[PDB]
User: What shape does this take?
Amino acid sequence: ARYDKYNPYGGGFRAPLAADWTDADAGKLYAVGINNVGAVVKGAGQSGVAGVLVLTKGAKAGSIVDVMKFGEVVEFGPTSGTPGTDFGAAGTAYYADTSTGAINSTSGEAKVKVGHTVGAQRLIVAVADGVVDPSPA
Amino acid sequence: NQGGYNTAGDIKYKTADGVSYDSLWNLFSNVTDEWNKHKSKMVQLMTFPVTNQTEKVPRIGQFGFEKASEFGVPESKRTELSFYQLAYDFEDYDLAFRYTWKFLRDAPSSQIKAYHNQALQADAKLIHRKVMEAIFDNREREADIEGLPYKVYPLYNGDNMIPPEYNGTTFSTGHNHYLVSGGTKIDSADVEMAADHIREHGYTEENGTQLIAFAHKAEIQEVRRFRFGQTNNNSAVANYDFVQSQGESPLYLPNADGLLGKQPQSMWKGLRVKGSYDDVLWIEEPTMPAGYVLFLATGGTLAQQNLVGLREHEDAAWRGLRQIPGNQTRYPLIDSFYQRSFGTGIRQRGGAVVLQIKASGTYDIPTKWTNGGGFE
Amino acid sequence: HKAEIQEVRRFRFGQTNNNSAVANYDFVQSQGESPLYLPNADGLLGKQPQSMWKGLRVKGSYDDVLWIEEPTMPAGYVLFLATGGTLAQQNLVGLREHEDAAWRGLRQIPGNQTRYPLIDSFYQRSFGTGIRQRGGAVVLQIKASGTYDIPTKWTNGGGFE
Amino acid sequence: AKGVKKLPKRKGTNPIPRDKWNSDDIARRQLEQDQKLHLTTKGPHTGTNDSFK
Assistant: This one.
């Protein structure tokens, strides 16, 4: 995954990273939230899911990261795939697991929609306000 | 070989029937073997002096356009570099003469000059074997340059180095220039396959190259018989025909009456040329082992420098054939050493093909040109 | 593509080819091809084909058509094309470009993100293609049965590369 | 000009075709070198005959 369209004024925001991100996460996409200190964590923080994040190289705690809420991500595939070889299905919705921050196409009542794909490799990021269904039947 | 110390008792006589032992050794004081003159010529037309101990070959990725739109903006494009790299091997070789004090007192000085001349011959034999090992031994080697290890390569050998793309042709891993004919006698099909395995990498007649095939006469005596659309060995049918060179005798010409085109040159680099097939010149190579053909590109934009690099030491004090003063000095024993240092590797991994004529199984290295098998 | 040229150069008058067809002409190789033995001292009736056409290299001729090895050509396809003469002074495909010179050629456009934190730049070209001389060429596909297939590398809407 | 060469033909008596080779040129050049490996001598006229077969 890579950022391709990002808008600094209300499309995303700066925040400090709560923990080190290792180079094993380089080029992966995660859904992210804010902890009670005001720093970025994978999955929902206290904030719920705030946005999505990609780093092109590993980064230390307390470094500043550009979280995306609205924009486009290219070279996209699910968080569990290998970056740059494994890619999304065309035309499908994508959902964050709020516990791990992992993104895949499987919908679920407690998951948060992060976007949908326009062809296999481009994700239109547009993060939902809350979970897919807060009142299951 | 005889070997050991030179001793009194190896001096057979001062004279026999009025002929001096000194005057016999004086004959051999300046002789050179006519085969060693040929081996030296083959090294000269098949090697270049290595100036750079390592080669790096980079490539760049590529991208395309997108269809435009009235309001929105394009996806972004990036590209990345990557490279292969190749090095040249290096090795040291030694020889000795040892004497007793009685021998140096009593022996003719002409025997010492004859010995020096024979070491200077054994040098030219060594370099030729190590140049031919570089081509025929289908195995990778390692070299250290500035303490970094590098791979040293033969031709393409079924390894994971992917050949460069050429004219939109994209090669895989496992590309291989050590070929087995799959039949007991050479086909036109085999010759055609082997020449095209070169020409797919560039090395074409449009690039200005000439292909040469060096073979033992047992294979040339098949190849001279290939006629267009006629059957050969192993039921192959020849897609071209063998045209004898301008100097070959008229009574060898086939049952034909005109030639479309021009006959091949009679001589190339001072070697006699038998003729050509598929625009490859065929040359009988005196050193070539029986069941093998070497196909080699020459003289284009590509292949403008010869196939094999000769690496030598960076300091002139360590280049050439050198005499070392030895460490038994003057009594009772004396010794002296000769040393030669160099090594070999191939940059143009696609610029030649080795074809072996056998019915089945994998390629064999010719015994005479295996690494570790000996020194000539 | 060379897979078809390696068949075509073997065609000989009155002899039989791949699908039991008999050749109504022989293939005659150009000057600068590898030499060939001929049954007769005069050998050839008529004139041998040119070695080079338009800076491309010619293999030879069959039925007075010049044959060219073309590395861009997909495997099972041949393009036959008329050139020169009274018709066909003008090439097969027209390139349309915009009427105003300010909008012709490859152009750089400065991009909406300018200096900090992000920077953009764009390249644009606009053009299109059509044929007038609808009879000026033929495409032959080598397949055993059924309808013509467009080469996947050249289906319209398949890609930009 | 025409692209065809007329091949040569038999003219009543033909020189015998013999194959030139690179190997045979080495052997000939070695033989004319080896021809120098001779010493002139005194004959049987030396009081010993151990050199003679």
